[PDB]
Structures are given as structure tokens and as C-alpha cells.
Paper text:
To improve the understanding of molecular interactions between xenon and transmembrane receptor targets, we investigated xenon binding with the Gloebacter violaceus ligand-gated ion channel (GLIC), a member of the pLGIC family, using X-ray crystallography under pressurized gas. Previously, the sensitivity of GLIC to gaseous anesthetics has been studied using 2-electrode voltage clamping techniques and this revealed that GLIC currents are inhibited by clinical concentrations of xenon. GLIC, whose X-ray structures has been solved in open, locally-closed (LC)–inactive- and resting-state conformations, is extensively used to identify binding sites of general anesthetics, channel blockers, alcohols, and other allosteric modulators in pLGICs. Here, we show by X-ray diffraction that xenon has multiple and specific binding sites in GLIC either in the open and LC (inactive) conformations, and that these binding sites differ between the two conformations.
Upon channel closure, the revolving motion of the M2-3 loop destabilises this network of interactions and Y197 predominantly adopts a downward conformation stabilized through hydrogen bonding with T255 (M3 helix). Indeed, the xenon-bound GLIC LC structure reveals that the contraction of the intra-subunit cavity constrains xenon binding to one single location at the cavity entrance. This unique xenon binding site has a markedly lower occupation (0.7) than the xenon intra-subunit sites in GLIC open form (0.9–1.0) further illustrating that the reshaping of the intra-subunit cavity in GLIC LC form limits xenon-binding to this cavity. Xenon binds to a novel site located in the pore, in (and only in) GLIC LC form. The inward movement of the M2 helices that occurs during the pore closure reduces the pore radius at position I233 (I9’) from 6 Å in GLIC open to 4 Å in GLIC LC and likely enables optimal hydrophobic interactions with xenon. The Xe atom is surrounded by the side chains of five Ile 233 (I9’) residues at a distance of 4.4 Å. In GLIC open form, xenon binds between M1 and M2 helices from one subunit and M2 helix from the adjacent subunit in the inner part of the TMD while in GLIC LC form, xenon binds between M1 helix from one subunit and M2 and M3 helices from the adjacent subunit in the outer part of the TMD. The location of a xenon atom in a functionally critical region of the pore could easily account for the inhibitory effect of xenon on GLIC.
Numbering used by the authors:
A (entry chain C), B (entry chain D), C (entry chain E), D (entry chain B), E (entry chain A): 5 to 315
Amino acid sequence: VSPPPPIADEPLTVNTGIYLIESYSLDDCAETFKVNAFLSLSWKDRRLAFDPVRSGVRVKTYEPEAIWIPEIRFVNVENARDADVVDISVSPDGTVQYLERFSARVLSPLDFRRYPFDSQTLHIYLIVRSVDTRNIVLAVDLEKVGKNDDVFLTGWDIESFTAVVKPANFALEDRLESKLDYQLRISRQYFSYIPNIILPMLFILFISWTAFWSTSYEANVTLVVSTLIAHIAFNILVETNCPKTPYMTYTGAIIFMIYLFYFVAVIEVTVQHYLKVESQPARAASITRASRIAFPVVFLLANIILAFLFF
Amino acid sequence: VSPPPPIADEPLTVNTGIYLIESYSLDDCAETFKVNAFLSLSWKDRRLAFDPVRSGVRVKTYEPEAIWIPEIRFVNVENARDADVVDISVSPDGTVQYLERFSARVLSPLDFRRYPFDSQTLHIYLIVRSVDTRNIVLAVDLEKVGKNDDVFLTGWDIESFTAVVKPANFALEDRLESKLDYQLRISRQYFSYIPNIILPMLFILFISWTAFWSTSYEANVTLVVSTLIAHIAFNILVETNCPKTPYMTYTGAIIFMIYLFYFVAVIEVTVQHYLKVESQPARAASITRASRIAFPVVFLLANIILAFLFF
Amino acid sequence: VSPPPPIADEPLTVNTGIYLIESYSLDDCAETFKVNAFLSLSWKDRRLAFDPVRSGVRVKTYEPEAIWIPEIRFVNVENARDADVVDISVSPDGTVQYLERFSARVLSPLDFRRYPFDSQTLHIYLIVRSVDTRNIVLAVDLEKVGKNDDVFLTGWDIESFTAVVKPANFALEDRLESKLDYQLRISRQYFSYIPNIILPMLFILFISWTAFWSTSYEANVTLVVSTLIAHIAFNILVETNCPKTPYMTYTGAIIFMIYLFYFVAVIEVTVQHYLKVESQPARAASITRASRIAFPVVFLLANIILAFLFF
Amino acid sequence: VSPPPPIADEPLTVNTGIYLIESYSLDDCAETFKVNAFLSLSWKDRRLAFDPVRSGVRVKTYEPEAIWIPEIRFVNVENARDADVVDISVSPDGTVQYLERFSARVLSPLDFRRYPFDSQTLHIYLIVRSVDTRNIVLAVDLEKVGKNDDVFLTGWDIESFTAVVKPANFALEDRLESKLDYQLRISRQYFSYIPNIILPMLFILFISWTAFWSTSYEANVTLVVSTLIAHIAFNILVETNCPKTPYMTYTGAIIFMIYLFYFVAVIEVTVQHYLKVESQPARAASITRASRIAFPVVFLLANIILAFLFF
Amino acid sequence: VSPPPPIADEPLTVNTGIYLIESYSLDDCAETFKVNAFLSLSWKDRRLAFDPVRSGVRVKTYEPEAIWIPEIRFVNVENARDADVVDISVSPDGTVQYLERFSARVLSPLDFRRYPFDSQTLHIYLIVRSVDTRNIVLAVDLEKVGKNDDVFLTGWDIESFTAVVKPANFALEDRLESKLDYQLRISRQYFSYIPNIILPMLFILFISWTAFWSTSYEANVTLVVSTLIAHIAFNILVETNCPKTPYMTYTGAIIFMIYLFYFVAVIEVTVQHYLKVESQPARAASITRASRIAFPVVFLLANIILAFLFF
Ligand SMILES: [Cl-]
Ligand SMILES: [Cl-]
Ligand SMILES: [Cl-]
Ligand SMILES: [Cl-]
Ligand SMILES: [Cl-]
Ligand code: NA
Ligand code: NA
Ligand code: NA
Ligand code: NA
Ligand code: NA
Ligand SMILES: [Xe]
Ligand SMILES: [Xe]
Ligand SMILES: [Xe]
Ligand SMILES: [Xe]
Ligand SMILES: [Xe]
Ligand SMILES: [Xe]
Ligand SMILES: [Xe]
Ligand SMILES: [Xe]
Ligand SMILES: [Xe]
Ligand SMILES: [Xe]
Ligand SMILES: [Xe]
Ligand SMILES: [Xe]
Ligand SMILES: [Xe]
Ligand SMILES: [Xe]
Ligand SMILES: [Xe]
Ligand SMILES: [Xe]
Ligand SMILES: [Xe]
Ligand SMILES: [Xe]
Ligand SMILES: [Xe]
Ligand SMILES: [Xe]
Ligand SMILES: [Xe]
């Protein structure tokens, strides 16, 4: 078998569609997600056209090996998809209606700059390579693009599953390549983050601030340094232990600031004690009293600046 | 190798049955479970009907490739099941009795709101796509549905394995599809949850409450902050090792409350010391004495409120 | 490609034998072990009998597809075994000497109640489903049941590899199933557990007991609470790395008791200080002096009770 | 299904080309990277020659099984690549133009001496073994070598993808082997390393230096030892998760120096207290005052020496 | 498709050779290593012997299915090797020269008693089972046993790759089996171990010894107990990540001794304080002064004893 001949000079249009059956194993570290879906393909092959009267059948069923089928591949996959041809139906005019069920581990970059208030667009790129006899172009039938109502990703809200109707046609290794962009829009379920991460982290930092209502250097050293240990310990507890980000994230900036605040609070505690020991209790007491307001105010202000910069 | 013809216009009924041989690898983090079972299939194909007299046999055995077999797939699976046809038996009236042994990693959502006192319903969805010449409908042969007595999941009690006899017939990709729901009901058996996680976690919290029978600020700071470190450390030790659930769990609420209590106990310790240092020992001593009763009472009360809200 | 016919009414006997080549990847957490072995099968098919004179050969070699072979499966496996047919030999009377090399991940429950002084019996269940024309029954020749001298599992002593000669014949889905039990007896190598886990864990607990020879509340609080942190930290280090079992283990009871002892020692330290501060140094000194004997004695006694209950 | 015959005695030239579609899963610990690319092959097999006039077609398409294809293997791969033949085109002269899409996990050594300011050259070695009838030699078709613009490796800048045009022809097991070197040059994106790892690690070290403005031995012991705990804790948190490299890395030297500085600061704190207790407050105060300058200066100097030695 | 007949009664000699292409993924915890190599096989079959004058070919090339090939298996493998037949050549005398490229995960026990100053001998056991008509014996072709110069294992020095030329012939399942031992000798690259693990672990222990130049019980308790926490914390950081070995290792003994030393130092600190408080400052001061020498001397001596016992 060889590609169907053109009636004029027109390229062959392969009408696609992807219907999500299952979405699972979204890996934030690897920036990969596992998908189980239907892939529908539709094209016209007049060599396969028939008279339903002199055939006795209104539809003809074929085996994949029996007829010409376009070679559709995915661009952003780990390995080639595991596919199972479900059905191949031919109508009297030569229209081929192909359907397969596939599973694939798709590689899609994730932007964590706004984590855990981030939204992601997961991509699935369909591609077809043209042959010398004729050019092959992809198209989307949006009626055939959908997802099962029970499709889920834990900790995410699945907004929509759509495709960018206009394909990306370009030349590669002296042949035309037609590419389609299938997009799965998801938004993170950030609720439990406040009581599970933020609030306890904030409490530890607030504990370190009680050193501003104490003159005991030994009790102050225990307060700021032991809370720093508790902060690090807490971060180990809730750390995914999975992603080291090249870029600066929102949460990443807050955490860096918290470390800076532990260092500044140590400097204060050190300064206050030194001034007290160096017969200057008026300056020590005035710094400690200022810190009581300065620390929560500078924190609340810098957080507003960060929230503004990232969102 | 075409579907059996209808006697009238009726759809083909494929009688199903699943018998669990082994259940294993239930992953709470991935919301998946590995199953090893028998899949029985029964349908009538009159093209296969024979006279036991002029044949000499009461039953006929066929190879899968020799006869028409419906394409049964699972909806909620990672990849297609690993199947091995055990037996194919045809009776004189054309009744086919198919049996295969399969293994599959099933994706089933889990509700952790009541953990570790939670119960789960694991789902296995059978499906069949109808063909050009006739519609295929699934049915349940209750005689063929069951589980091996030795079937186990560590830390779980297997209540029952049943199927919702009425199939879910709907339209998918312009063809009728009949779906079945097989349910495995399991309840968490975690006898050791109390001694292993709860009690050591409560002991650490109770140690922090000894600061209410002490006036030493240095000893009190060491008590509340060091126990907070011990609490966090203990939670790293008994860590679920599962990514935090988006929703608020029962255990999650108790743990959040424990962090809040560590913060409140710090506030008390800070207030008591400040009042003492600011020549008000009557109000400091009255707060510390109230806390001795207030802390266990508010804890025991809030826990009853939480237990009521979740159960 | 039909089962051999009976001479009278008797069922077909398939003589089995498993010879362990390699045993590896014993996962305590998954309760699974990977095995690489030989599977020998012996049966008589009179349709295969021949005259060695006419044939010119004393033995005949066949391909698996050329002759009838019983469908032997394993009950407690993740997926069907990866098998490679090594040899098929037919003697002039129609006796078949089948041999294959296989690898399989076997699921076998493990009892950790006596850990690390536990012994386990690993099971491999062979099974055959009886066919339409005649019943198939399994048998063992214990001469053919063996293991390579170099077979090993790190941290275990392999006592024996045997089979329960009497098969378990039962009805399942209206047919007979003949099941065989192959047992691998292993006993844990518990020596490094004393210097690596037990002894350092006891030293940490003993350090907390030095608070009974001190009147300094600040030093005592640091002793009991810092050792509790060290205990938890040590447990994180020597993590069994297995999720807590549902049942109460021997080691599990000892560890729970150690947490209880840290709580009791805190109560003592708190009581001592309170009586000392509340003008009662006679009681505080008598309690502390009693604790010096009470704590090691109650510990040593409760440990004897636990060791008695578990063993 | 035999190699093409030589016209004289010349070796067969197989023109190669690799075009990267996707690059992912670069494992620093395993020294491996997963690649998804096109592999183009071109050679002359005159036995496949045809007249485009008699055939009608200007190019002929073949199935891989229909014609002879050179056995190209990769030297540094875990297992043989997962390949999918995209196209096989034969021109009238008998020139074959082969194209396949493959995925492979490539093993390439990584030098971490300059981490996180390191650059790496990832290698892909193509190889062909010569046959009985004729020698096979590899060549590079530069028109067919490249990478997709969207190719990315999280935390890396992809500089270039090139091939060393001159093959390495050598004898192995009495036959000629022609080897090609495909190189992917990458450089690490080290920015978030400063605020995420370096800066919080420096703050903990600086906190330990506040002991040089304190005479309280109890407060000093708490400062240096508690910060050492915080340092270790922080290292557990931002752990590379890679086993210690056999060689001494840049970051490895800095961390070793930080441990040495914690030990030296302890020695100082111990010396200062001993001199004070042994009626020598002039010597104690002069050491502590010197340390205030000595510690940051020696640190800043040794860091310059290390940066010079490694870069 | 029957073994070659013997000229007399001699067994068939299969000359073997393994050439390492790649060595990777050496897992200490799993005691496995992944290998990628060539397997050469040579044997004489006179049924394939031909006259070169009337045939006119250097060597005849065959497909695996076309001729008899001995079934060579590996003893110590997880699953059967992934093999790709590279070449099959037959010379006029009937000498078959077989070559395949394979990948396999080999199970080889590792002795960690001398870690990290250990050397290992990795084993690859070739095996052949004799057949009905004749016995098969393995031999080593030393010209075909080697390794690629670029073969590497991170953290190891690859000394040599050799084979024990004399096979181990024994009876198994009533047939003769000829076994060959291929050995890969490797020695660990222990340099970064001193600055990364040993030296910071000794510094933490040395810090605990500063308690011998202090009379402050509160400062001493903080010294010994906080360093014990730092030691455990450090061990978590540079954790082997391998499950505890059943046997006592060199490093294991040193670490056990370090825990014993922390306990002894606590006893001293406790004894010194008790003697001081129980009006015996002469006895207390003499113990603390002795400990200053006793602790480093006993440590240095016991370490020499351990180093002597293990090496
Ligand atoms: Cl694909
Ligand atoms: Cl399926
Ligand atoms: Cl099986
Ligand atoms: Cl390859
Ligand atoms: Cl093998
Ligand atoms: Na086709
Ligand atoms: Na069929
Ligand atoms: Na057969
Ligand atoms: Na070929
Ligand atoms: Na053969
Ligand atoms: Xe998607
Ligand atoms: Xe955060
Ligand atoms: Xe601040
Ligand atoms: Xe189920
Ligand atoms: Xe909890
Ligand atoms: Xe907190
Ligand atoms: Xe409270
Ligand atoms: Xe077993
Ligand atoms: Xe210890
Ligand atoms: Xe224990
Ligand atoms: Xe506790
Ligand atoms: Xe006790
Ligand atoms: Xe590369
Ligand atoms: Xe910090
Ligand atoms: Xe660093
Ligand atoms: Xe210094
Ligand atoms: Xe090896
Ligand atoms: Xe240190
Ligand atoms: Xe700590
Ligand atoms: Xe060590
Ligand atoms: Xe000692």
C-alpha cells in the first residue's frame, strides 16, 4: 500500500481527535503525565470506495495491515505510545474512520513561578510526516475532542481539554511536517496548603519574635536558634524532596525571606545583648521595642511586594 | 470472524464474571491497586451450534483465533491487562464459555477524609464497544463473581467483591458502549494506629504542658520549643510518604490543631514571663494556673468537635 | 492438541518439580520475592508412544506447539511467569519430560510479630485447571524439588526448599483445580541488630535516666527532652523503611514502651521540681532516689514480660 | 537479506544523521539521559534498482523485512533503543533513504568538580560491525544532523548538538567496527543555587560567629553546637540526593571547610572559657576580639583560594 | 535442528568469550550490576561442513532459526538476557562462529566487611545443559575475552575482566551441566570518604570531649547530648542508603564505638557532677583531668585494634 492519489494537487487531510479516558501519574519533578485515551483518524481513500449494492454491505471493516494508514506520532512522548486498534470502518465513498486506544507518558514543561496558586496547560503534540507522492496535513474535529467526566488528577481542577485547530506546518529533513496542539488546562487545589504548610511555618517565625519581649540572652539564643532548627525540620517534613527549581518561585522567595528574617533576628538579639553588656541599656531597650513593630510590619510589607511581583 | 447474527433485532448479551485470585500492591499515594483474577465471558453464537450425536462430543474446544470473541476492555486501567486464555468451551446450542486469567493495575480514587478509620470502594469498570452489524450489551453472571478466601491486602479488611448488575449503556465516538461496575469493598484495619502514631504524638504535646507548673522562663522556652522540634521530628519519622491531599483530612485537622496548641503555649509562656518582669505576678500566676485546666479541657473539647464533624 | 485419553476413568497425573537457581529481591514491605528456577513437568501421552526400532531414535524431541502440554499456572504471582522451554523429551512409551526455566515475582504474606528474631515460610502455589474431556491432578517428586547451593537472600538463612506432596484438589467455576504448595523456609540473621539498632537506642534512654542524679530542673529538662529528640532522630536513621504494620510487633511494643518511659521520666522531673519549689524537698528527694531503682527495674521487668508474650 | 555486493572491493558507506526531538530525564546520580530522536540512514543497494518508467513511481517504498538494512547499534546505551521505522525510500539507482524514530537511555559520564557552575558534553556513540562479504563504514550527513528548537533539559542551557564527522574505525573480534561520536553540549543554570542553598547555609555559619561578642560559655555552647545541628539539618533538606562523588568537588570542599570552621569555633569557645576560668581574662578577651576579624577574613580568603583552584 | 553427531564418543566443546562494551548501574543495596557485552560462541558441526572449491564462499551466513545453536544461559541473572544476534558464520570444516550483543542485570554478592576500602569480584556464570544424543562442555577462547577501554563504574577502579578457563561440570536434573566463571575485578575509590564522612564525624565527637575542660553541668549536658543529636543528624545526611548488613562491617564497628563513647562521656559528666554535689571535688577534678587523656588514647587504641582485626 501507498498513499491515496490526489484528485487535483491538494494535500491529504487527516482529521484527528483525542478523547481522554484516564489521566493519571502527573509528576511535578519529571514534568511528565500519563494519559490513556482514544485517537480517532479520518481521511478519504477513493481506492477504497465501493458500491453498497454490488457489495451487500453499507460499511467495510479492514485490518490495519490490509489498507494504507497515515503514520501519526506524538512529539513530546518518552517512548512511542502503546496502541490498540479498536476499529477501522470504510464507507462507500472511501472515507476511512480509524479508532485506536492508546497509553502514553507525555513530557510537558511546568511553570512553578506561582506555586501553589499555579495553573498549567498540559500539551500533547500530534505529528505527521509527508511522503514524496503527496503532502499530509492534520485537522481537528472538535466534536471528536473530549474527556471522560470521571477523568481526574489529585490536587487539580481539570478546566478543559481542547485543540488548537490551526496546525503548525513546517519543513524538516526535506519533508513537510504538520503538527497539532492538544491542550489540557488544569488549576491547582491550593486549599490544604494554608493549614498544612504556611500557617505552621508562620507560627515558628512568630515564636522567634517573642525574643523581642525578653532581655535574657540565654533564653533569646534558645528562641531564635531552636526555631531556626524547627523551621528547617518543618521544611524537611513538608518538602516534596522532588524538585530543585532553576528559577525563583513565589514560595521560594517567601522561604528565602524567612531565612533572612532568622538571621536579622539573631543580629538584633546579638546587638541588644552587646549594648546591654557595654553599659548602654537605653539603646538596647529602644532597638528591642522598635523590633516588636519593625519585624511584623517589614514582613507583612515585603510579602505584599512579593505577592504583587509574582501576581 | 464476524459477530453472531441476531435472531430478531436484539443486541448480543455478553455474560461476565470476575473471580479475584490475588489482590496486592494497593498504593495510597498513586490511588492504584494491582489485581490478578479470572474473567469469564458467555454469549450465544448459533453458527457454533452442533449435534452431539453426529459429532461424538458433548462440548467443543476452540482456539481464540478460530472463533469470534467480544473485545472486552477495562476503563480505569494504567495499560491494557496482561491476559492468557485459560479455556474456550462451546455447548451443542451454540453457547460459548470463555475464561482467561489476567493481571491489571487499576486506577481507583481514594477518600482519605476519615483516615485511618476510612473504608474504600475499589472499582473495576468492564466495557464493550458495539460493532457495525450489531450492538453488544454486558450482563453479570453472579455464579461466576467472587474472590479467593486467601485474598488479602495488608492493613485492610476485605468486606465484599460484588458487581452492579445493571450496565451503564451510553454513546461514545458514535457507537453504543455497555459498561459494568465491579466493586471491592475494603475497610482500613489499623489496630496499631493509636500506639504507633497517636500516643507518642500526644505524649510530646503533654510534655509541653509541664511549662504550666514552672516559673523558669529559660526552662519553659526549652520545654515548648524543644517539644515542637520533637513533634516535627516524630512526624518526619511516621510520615505518610504520600503527597499531601488537597482536602482537609481528619488526622490533618488534629495535626493542624497540635501546631496551633504549640503556638498558644508559646504565647502563654511569653505572656507569663512579661507580666512577671513587668511587676504583675498576680496576673501571671493566675494565667499559668488557668492554663493547667484550660489547655487539656480545650484540647479534649475541640477533639470531640472534630470527631463529630468528620464522623 | 487435545488432552491424552484415559485408560480406565483415572485423572491425568502431572508430576512436578521446582529447582531454585536464584532467589533475590525479597521485599519485606511489599511481602514479595523474586525467584528464578527450573520447572519440570512429567506426564504420559500414549498418542506419543513409538517403536525405537522403526524410528531409529531412543528419545524424541518436540517443540511446545507440536504436542499437548498442561497449562500450569502459579496462584500467588504478580503477573504470569516469564518462561523459556529448555527441553521436551518423549520416550518410546509416550512419557513427556518437559523442562522450562522461569522467573516470577511471588506474593507471600510475612509475619513480623517476632522481628528481628522471625522465621518465614515463603510459598509458591502451582495450579492446573481440569479440562472438558478429563481431570488433571498434580503430583510432586521430592527428588526433583531442590535449590542451588549458592542461592542466597541477604540477611537470611535458607533452611530448606520442599513441597507438600498431597495436592489441594477443589472445585472452582464448575471445574477441578489441583494445587501444590512449594515452601521455602528462611530464618533472619539478627546479629548486627544488637550493635546497630538495640544498643544505641538503649544508651539514649539510659542518658535520660541521669536526671535522677540531678536537682537542676534546667539541666533535667535538657536531658529528658533532648534525648527524646535523639531517640526520634535515631529511629529516623535506623528506619525499618517498612510502613507500620497493622498488627503489634515485638520491636513495636519495645519502642512504644520507650516513648512511655520518656513521658514518665518527664512527669518525674516535673513532680520533683514542683515539690522542691512548693517547700516539700523531702518528697522530691525520696521520689528521685526511688526512680534511680524503679526506672531500670520496671524496664527490665516489662521487657521480660514482652519477650515472654511474643516468644 | 545479505549485504549489497561491492562494484570493486570498496567498503559500504552508511551516511548517518541524528535529529533531537526531545531530551529529558537527565539523571545526575546515574550519569544517564533519556533521548527521543530521528535516526536517518543512507546507503546504495543496487539489487533494489528499478526503472521509474516501467514502474511508474519515481521512488519505491519498502517494509524493513523486505530489504537489507545495516545493523546500527549504540555503544553507550542501557538496553537497545526502542525504534519505530518512519520511512524507507529507494530511488532508481538503488540508494536507500531510511528514517526511524527512537528513544534511548544513554550512559554518559559527568564531571561534577565545578558543580553548580559545570558544563557537560553528552555523548551518543553510533556503531556498525562489518560483515563477511564486505566492510561497512559510517559517515555524517550534516544536512541530517540537528535538534528541535523546543528541546529542553530543566536547569540546563543546550549549547549545541554536533557530530565528529571522522569515524573511529578499529578491529574488534576479528572484524572492522566504524564508530561515530554525537555530542550534546549543555551548561548548568546555577542562579537559584545562591538564594536556595549558598545564602541560607552562610547565615547559619554567621550565627555561630556571634559567640565572638559573648562571654557566656552556656550561651556560646548553645550558639556553635545548635548552629552545627541547623547546618546538618539544612544539608539534609537541600541534599543533592546523589551519592558522594569519589572525587572532591568545588561545593564539596566549601562544605568540608564549613565543618572545619564549626570545629575551630568550638575550640575558640573552649579556649576562651578555660583561660577565663584559669584567671587569664586578658588572653581570653584578646583571642575572642581577634576571632571577630580572623574568622570572616580566613573564610573569605580560603574561599578565594578554593575558587582559584577549581576555576 | 538436532545437536551435531560425535566422531567418536567425545562431548561437544562450545568455545565462549565475553567482551564488555558497557558496565553500569552497580547497586550495592541490591547486590546487582547491569552489563552490556558481546557473547561469542564457537563449535564444530560437520553437517554444515562444505567443500570450498565446489561452493565458492569464504564463510556461509545463516539465520538463527536455520541451524542448531547451543542454548547458553546465565546462572546469576534477574531475568533472561536481552540478546540480539549480530553474526553467524560457518567455515568449510563446519566451525560455527556465533556472535550476539546482550544486556543483563547480573546478581553478584558483595562483601562490605572492609568498606570503603573494599575490593569486589563480580561474577557472570555461563551455563549449558547437555542434550539426549550428546554431552555439551564449555571452553574459554581467551582471544575473545576482554573489555572496552572506556568501560567505567563511578567510584570504582576496574582492575581486570577474566574467565576461569576450567569449567565446573556437574549433574543437574539428570543431565550434565558445564558452568564457566567470568570475573570482573573492581576496587573502590575511597578518597572523598575521609573529608566527606570520617573527618566531620570525628569533629562532632571531639566537640563532646570539650566537656572535660568544663565544670558547668548545664554546659556539659548541652555539649554531650547536643553533639549526640548532631552525630545522628550527620549519619542521616551521609546515610549509606543501603539496608543494614547482617554482618559486622569495619565502618559499622567504628560507628558502634562512637555511640559507646557518647554514652561513656555522659557517664563521666554525670559522675563528675554527682561527686562535686556530694562534697568530693578532689575525686571529680581527678576523673575529668584523667578523661582529657583517657578518651583520645582509648579511642586511638581501639581504632588501631579494629583496623588490625578487619585488615
Ligand atoms: Cl508516539
Ligand atoms: Cl484492558
Ligand atoms: Cl504463571
Ligand atoms: Cl541500540
Ligand atoms: Cl540468560
Ligand atoms: Na498499513
Ligand atoms: Na477472532
Ligand atoms: Na501445543
Ligand atoms: Na532485513
Ligand atoms: Na535452531
Ligand atoms: Xe493533554
Ligand atoms: Xe512558604
Ligand atoms: Xe526587620
Ligand atoms: Xe474491584
Ligand atoms: Xe494524629
Ligand atoms: Xe508552631
Ligand atoms: Xe487553650
Ligand atoms: Xe518459595
Ligand atoms: Xe548513645
Ligand atoms: Xe527496639
Ligand atoms: Xe514521649
Ligand atoms: Xe518507672
Ligand atoms: Xe548526545
Ligand atoms: Xe539563617
Ligand atoms: Xe556550598
Ligand atoms: Xe580563623
Ligand atoms: Xe562481570
Ligand atoms: Xe564539626
Ligand atoms: Xe535539637
Ligand atoms: Xe565511619
Ligand atoms: Xe575512655
